[PDB]
Symmetry: C6
């Protein structure tokens, strides 16, 4: 169903945001 | 239906965040 | 309907993220 | 009720992303 | 209800994006 | 239920945005 599809996209979005934070952390260090 | 439309916009959102994560 | 309104705001959000992603960096 | 409240928060989110885009544009142009 | 919980998380999300816009502004002006 | 799952992913998204705001702050300050 579509509510499950929505939850799955939000999970993917959280994962991408986590990756963005991790990359920014490297920039902040350097 | 609108729930499908919502899921499709979230997919577009994930795609652009994936580009942001990747770049630079 | 409010579901349509939600879909329309998410479309606007995708569009702003597309602009953010694809603005050429200095 | 709550679906309207959700729509209103998404509008606020779009507005903040527009501000982010505007400031990144300024970073790019400095 | 969970719809209220969703609205409350979107409010938190808007608040974090406002913080991000302010920090991009600091980068632009810094 | 899936509405709860959606709320939980939005909570994760708020947390990652908080991390991004922190890292942008770190970039702004060197």
């Amino acid at each position: 169903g579509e509510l499950k599809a929505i939850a799955q996209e939000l999970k993917a979005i959280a994962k991408e945001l986590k990756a963005i934070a991790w990359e920014e952390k490297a920039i902040a260090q350097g």
